[PDB]
């Protein structure tokens, strides 16, 4: 009965992570909407991130039920819709993180131009644009997402592969990995390291107190924004590549990668909302 106990433990961990993420996103949305703080551009990207993470936490119970029942009698169309939503919310969250990083870059490095294109209007347009981009990226993952017949006689909600099995699967996995990892993490790392370089250059040109034991916190923030993300996402893609290209059979270890990936999206609210000096006044009031 080791397999049943392991499955029960994995489902319990999934449920705990889902509840934590849901409560965190609910608190974030409440702080954002009740206090009427949706007036700046920095308060709209965080709200869209919270909405995307809430959609992810609402789609998690579908994966939990799929792990528990292992049958999914819900249907093929509902399976396709759930997979599409589960993918598009993650992609929208990642794109909103990238947009927030680029906005902070333009703000703290190109201040002049910034205000021209940074009003609380352009933010909704950028949100709609990244939503359309996420929808377009997920559209190829919509036709393949169907229910296939297994050997035991149960349907499985997975991505159907065309006649070329080894070619198109590796192509899709590689494209998803390449884009989703390199583009957002690159756009977040280059911009933040340029911000740090500009801040250090300004501090050196205007040297009055180079220590700045706070900028230490800024640096730490950037480093976190990018270390937890890597540690949570890169092993997942590595395990996917090993299971696709090499096809190495092992124990139930791929579930931990998905658990860490959602814990990343559950902890994103902390990193971006809880640590902001822009929320302590709202928390105290």
């Amino acid at each position: 009965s080791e397999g049943q106990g392991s499955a029960i433990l994995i489902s319990f961990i999934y449920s705990v992570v889902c509840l934590v993420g849901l409560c965190g996103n609910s608190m974030v949305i409440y702080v954002i909407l009740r206090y009427a703080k949706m007036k700046t551009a920095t308060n709209i990207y965080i709200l869209n991130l919270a909405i995307a993470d809430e959609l992810l936490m609402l789609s998690v119970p579908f994966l939990v039920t799929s792990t528990l029942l292992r049958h999914w009698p819900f249907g093929a169309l509902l399976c396709r819709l759930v997979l599409s939503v589960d993918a598009v919310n993650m992609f929208t969250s990642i794109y909103c993180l990238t947009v927030l990083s680029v906005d902070r870059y333009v703000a703290v490095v190109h201040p002049i131009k910034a205000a021209r294109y940074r009003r609380p209007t352009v933010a909704k347009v950028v949100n709609l644009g990244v939503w359309v981009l996420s929808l377009l990226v997920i559209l190829p993952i919509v036709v393949f997402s169907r229910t296939a017949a297994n050997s035991d006689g149960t349907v499985a909600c997975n991505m159907l592969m065309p006649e070329p099995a080894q070619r198109w699967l590796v192509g899709f996995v590689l494209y998803t990995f390449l884009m989703g990892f390199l583009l957002p993490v690159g756009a977040i790392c280059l911009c933040y390291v340029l911000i740090i370089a500009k801040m250090r250059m300004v501090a050196l040109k205007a040297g009055w107190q180079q220590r700045k034991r706070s900028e230490r916190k800024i640096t730490l923030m950037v480093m976190m924004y990018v270390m937890v993300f890597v540690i949570c996402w890169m092993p997942f893609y590595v395990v996917q590549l090993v299971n696709v290209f090499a096809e190495q059979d092992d124990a139930t270890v791929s579930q931990l990668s998905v658990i860490l990936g959602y814990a990343n999206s559950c902890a994103n609210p902390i990193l971006y909302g809880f640590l902001s000096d822009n929320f302590k006044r709202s928390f105290q009031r």
Partner: peptide, 6 residues
């Protein structure tokens, strides 16, 4: 495959 075991 995708967010599952295969």
């Amino acid at each position: 495959x995708x967010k599952y075991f295969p």
